[PDB]
């Protein structure tokens, strides 16, 4: 409004702050990645959550976090809310494969309208605001001490999708064990498309790859939680893509009674 842009900035600020907390643990030679209350993962997720809510609690909108303490009855009346996963990609983190993410979405009337994904190891930030665009900012660790604004972030970032035409079809999969349902769909894609390539990336980067134009489709026929898709879904939408409920024409919906997502497919917005 006069306020939406400031909320977007808050999400970016929060994601970077969380990123710092996570990376400090990830990079610490004293961290014991063989460890639970005192596991590196548990501590990082908690510190990330704390960094994020320190900012988001100040905003006018309530917070639904993966690391937060609540009943559906409480949140069912929240028309606008933050949906957050402070640290997605458990295996990426604990096995030190490096493609874990911070995920912050603003959801309004069950639709993700702003999203931020930060990839702390890679210092890659994706963000989007419905009606403005989706953007990628590479090489960012934190904000300057002075002068930083959303308008400046947008100016300095790359609008998505990023232009590079290719004549071949690309699908993206997890680096973890794929479900037989996902593998079956991919097998069918491989039969349908003569010039097919598969690529893989951690966490919600898979949604980002479609938004970037680096992949045509990200099918996930596996259980995931709202907080792991919401941010990427906002980003996808602002890039001309969509995150469909697999087998339906309807996008994934949010702030549901059950926070599990159904199967989804990220692809270009249909006709």
Number of amino acids touching Cl ion (CB under 5 A): 4
Residue ranges of the binding site for Mg(2+)? 66, 85, 87-88, 228
- Closest to Cl ion by CB, 13 vs 99, is 99
Q: Is the preceding peptide bond at 161 cis, omega within 30 degrees of 0?
A: yes
Using CB positions, name the residue nearest to Cl ion.
Answer: 182
Tokens of 55: 């900012």
- Closest to Cl ion by CB, 118 vs 185, is 185
- Closest to Cl ion by CB, 82 vs 221, is 221
Provide, rounded to whole angstroms, the least separation between the CB of residue 175 and Cl ion: 11
d(CA 34, CA 25): 14
- Closest to Cl ion by CB, 178 vs 252, is 178
d(CA 169, CA 209): 13
Q: According to the binding rule CB under 5 A, does residue 182 interact with Cl ion?
A: yes
SS3 19: helix
Q: Which of 108, 179, 224, 245: binder of Cl ion (CB under 5 A)? A: 179
Residue ranges of the binding site for substrate? 66, 87-90, 228
Please choose, from the candidates 209, 234, 189, 200, the residue with its C-alpha nearest in 3D space to the C-alpha of residue 83.
Answer: 234
d(CA 19, CA 29): 18
How far, rounded to the nearest angstrom, does the alpha carbon of residue 102 sit from its chain's CA centroid? 7
Q: Are 209 and 203 in contact (CB under 8 A)?
A: no
Contacts to Cl ion from residues 197-236, by CB under 5 A: 222
Q: Give the CA distances from residue 139 to residues 106, 118, 136, 156, in Å, rounded to whole numbers and listed in that order.
A: 24, 11, 10, 11
Please choose, from the candidates 103, 129, 128, 117, the residue with its C-alpha nearest in 3D space to the C-alpha of residue 225.
Answer: 103
Tokens of 188: 């069918």
Q: What is the contact mask toward Cl ion in residues 49 to 88, using x (rule: CB under 5 A)? A: ----------------------------------------
- Closest to Cl ion by CB, 158 vs 197, is 197
Q: Which of 51, 55, 114, 178: binder of Cl ion (CB under 5 A)? A: 178
Provide, rounded to whole angstroms, the least separation between the CB of residue 221 and Cl ion: 6
Provide, rounded to whole angstroms, the least separation between the CB of residue 182 and Cl ion: 3
Interface contacts to Cl ion, rule CB under 5 A: 178-179, 182, 222
């Amino acid at each position: 409004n006069l306020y939406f842009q400031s909320n977007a900035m808050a999400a970016i600020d929060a994601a970077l702050k969380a990123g710092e907390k996570i990376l400090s643990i990830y990079e610490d030679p004293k961290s014991d990645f063989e460890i639970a209350d005192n596991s590196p993962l548990t501590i990082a997720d908690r510190k990330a959550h704390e960094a994020i809510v320190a900012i988001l609690n100040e905003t006018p909108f309530p917070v639904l976090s993966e690391e937060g303490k609540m009943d559906y009855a409480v949140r069912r009346g929240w028309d606008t809310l933050w949906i957050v996963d402070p640290l997605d990609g458990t295996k990426e983190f604990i096995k030190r494969n490096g493609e874990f993410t911070v995920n912050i979405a603003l959801v309004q009337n069950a639709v993700p309208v702003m999203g931020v994904i930060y990839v702390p190891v890679k210092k890659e930030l994706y963000f989007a605001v419905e009606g403005t665009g989706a953007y990628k900012c590479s090489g960012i660790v934190g904000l300057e001490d002075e002068g930083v604004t959303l308008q400046q972030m947008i100016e300095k970032s790359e609008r998505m999708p990023l232009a590079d035409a290719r004549d071949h079809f690309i699908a993206v999969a997890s680096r973890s064990h794929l479900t037989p349902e996902t593998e079956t769909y991919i097998a069918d894609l491989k039969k349908k498309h003569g010039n097919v390539e598969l690529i893989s990336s951690g966490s919600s980067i898979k949604i980002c790859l479609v938004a970037e134009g680096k992949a045509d489709v990200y099918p996930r026929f596996a259980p995931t939680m709202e907080w792991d898709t919401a941010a990427g879904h906002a980003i996808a939408r602002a890039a001309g893509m969509e995150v469909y409920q697999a087998g339906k024409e309807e996008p994934l919906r949010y702030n549901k009674e059950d926070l599990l997502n159904p199967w989804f497919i990220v692809e270009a917005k249909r006709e």
